[PDB]
Design an enzyme around this catalytic site. Sequence first.
Site, PDB file in Angstrom:
ATOM      1  CG  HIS A 198      -0.413  -0.124   2.499  1.00  0.00           C
ATOM      2  ND1 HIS A 198       0.066   0.946   3.226  1.00  0.00           N
ATOM      3  CD2 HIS A 198      -0.238  -1.218   3.278  1.00  0.00           C
ATOM      4  CE1 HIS A 198       0.527   0.515   4.385  1.00  0.00           C
ATOM      5  NE2 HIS A 198       0.350  -0.794   4.444  1.00  0.00           N
ATOM      6  CG  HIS A 245      -0.071   8.696   3.001  1.00  0.00           C
ATOM      7  ND1 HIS A 245      -0.792   7.552   3.271  1.00  0.00           N
ATOM      8  CD2 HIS A 245       0.725   8.902   4.081  1.00  0.00           C
ATOM      9  CE1 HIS A 245      -0.465   7.098   4.464  1.00  0.00           C
ATOM     10  NE2 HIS A 245       0.453   7.895   4.980  1.00  0.00           N
ATOM     11  CD  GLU A 275      -2.916   9.507   5.110  1.00  0.00           C
ATOM     12  OE1 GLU A 275      -2.272   9.591   6.182  1.00  0.00           O
ATOM     13  OE2 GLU A 275      -3.474   8.452   4.726  1.00  0.00           O
ATOM     14  CB  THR A 285      -3.529   7.716   8.444  1.00  0.00           C
ATOM     15  OG1 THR A 285      -2.316   7.424   7.748  1.00  0.00           O
ATOM     16  CG2 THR A 285      -3.351   8.938   9.325  1.00  0.00           C
TER      17      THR A 285
HETATM   18 ZN   LIG Z   1       1.291   7.676   6.808  1.00  0.00          ZN
END
Ligand SMILES: [Zn+2]
Length: 258
Positions: A62, A94, A104, A196
Amino acid sequence: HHWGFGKHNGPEHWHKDFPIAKGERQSPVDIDTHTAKYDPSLKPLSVSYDQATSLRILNNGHAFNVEFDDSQDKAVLKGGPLDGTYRLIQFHFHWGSHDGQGSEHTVDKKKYAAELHLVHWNTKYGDFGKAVQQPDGLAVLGIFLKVGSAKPGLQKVVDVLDSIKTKGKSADFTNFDPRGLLPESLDYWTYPGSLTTPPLLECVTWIVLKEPISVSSEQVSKFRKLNFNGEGEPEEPMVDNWRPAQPLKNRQIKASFK
Ligand SMILES: [Zn+2]
Ligand SMILES: [Cl-]
């Protein structure tokens, strides 16, 4: 695991396996600069990465994590809102399917192209696994990425990504200095929150830098050439691996500045 970033296993679904997903201290959050309050109790951040010893970089399906030898007792985050000492264990990012999303945290609803998380654990708990079970277990330093000039200190990271394209692949990644990923200013916002990604544990003091780092279009485009899938399986570009902002509920975001 079942969770991912797909339509049927993505963030909107995580609460079914991790009910804390609908908890009181979930991350990330939108930082409303209108209401974030300056707090003079807040000390300068102390980021000491001279002795940080990177080991390897891994595509975990991921994101990619750069892992550190967290026995290095001098590679430490302290100060700011924190009591005691926190050891650097990994960083990851991310990012989005295009430059207009990926972060995020948001600032007045503004999404950045990506966000860097430098993850540290509280030495008072002995190791990472024990720390994540405590409300003051982790400190995560978050840094926004926007597109413009290139960040020279990121180049070793983006150039190694070709060799870790699919889930499970790793590469040696020694002598990487994370100081090359820091902006000029250590001005920050801070609030109590969570991991997260699952398990979403409410164990994190978030410290989010006000100043983004600039990275080039090409640097961030390399992130999107990674794949979620393992080798030999059907190609799925690793993009939009960000959890959206969660309810702030009864929390106060404090600012170290203005
Ligand atoms: Zn993170
Ligand atoms: Cl590049």
